[PDB]
């Protein structure tokens with residue numbers, strides 16, 4: 001699972017859950033397909049090292065990278081463009097793991113996946129491994145610390161008697177997510193209790209309907225609207241505008257929280273600034 005590195009000493013020998021690579025120190029031509037780790041490059045002052053980004057899925061908080069060469073999207077990866085750039089490192093997360101062999105023929109390929117069962121330790125390991133490549137451990141540790149302090153401030157205000165349900169909307173369908181899922185940080189790190197701790201985890205979640213939401217009667221509903229990312233016309237607010245949901249504590253107290261999908265769905269959890277924004281977004285919704 002974790003990334004491990006030995007100094008060798010114009011490069012590191014690096015092992016991660018997908019394989020092994022010789023990575024040069026201070027790489028100067030990096031193609032990044034994980035949006036969180038791209039934000040981390042910004043935070044570490046490594047902008048000039050980046051030579052390709054998935055411009056098709058570039059969110060509002062990463063527009064300083066809008067003039068970098070495009071390598072397509074996080075799903076629609078453009079291999080010819082990657083190859084034409086002649087990168088010295090490619091950095092990927094779980095969306096691209098199915099392209100690993102093809103990517104690794106072009107250049108050493110680092111996997112920075114987030115472990116849903118161990119979010120914080122994977123986050124730390126991803127960030128510190130990237131910073132090791134550049135001799136920036138001290139800086140990265142200080143910014144990791146600030147994240148921990150933000151986490152403690154958020155936890156401080158959580159009402160231990162209330163419960164939340166996490167849902168994803170897509171076209172007209174609703175699915176639910178719980179602890180240890182792709183959104184589990186809400187329960188697992190920030191301390192917010194779940195209406196159902198036993199939701200089977202899966203990439204796009206457990207299928208449910210409004211009767212189920214009413215039955216659980218959450219105090220907070222956290223909504224990730226995938227429609228926004230795919231450019232469908234439907235919106236979670238429409239799907240949830242019905243009599244079953246309306247009866248819930250969440251609806252009555254206006255605690256149906258539409259989380260920014262450019263952070264939560266595109267999944268920029270590896271970012272030293274973007275993870276802080278997510279933590280703030282939760283905190284401010286429940287304080």
Ligand SMILES: O=C(N[C@@H](COC(=O)[C@H](CO)NC(=O)c1cccc(O)c1O)C(=O)O)c1cccc(O)c1O
Nearest residue numbers: 073074075076094095096182203204229230265266267
């Ligand atoms: O519509 C998309 N993908 C297809 C096909 O998706 C996949 O290849 C698989 C599911 O078949 N998805 C992933 O592997 C995946 C992995 C991590 C996080 C994800 O959101 C994922 O979708 C689908 O859901 O049918 C899509 C477009 C942009 C961003 C996404 O996250 C998407 O899921």
Ligand SMILES: [Fe+3]
Nearest residue numbers: 203204226265
């Ligand atoms: Fe997806």
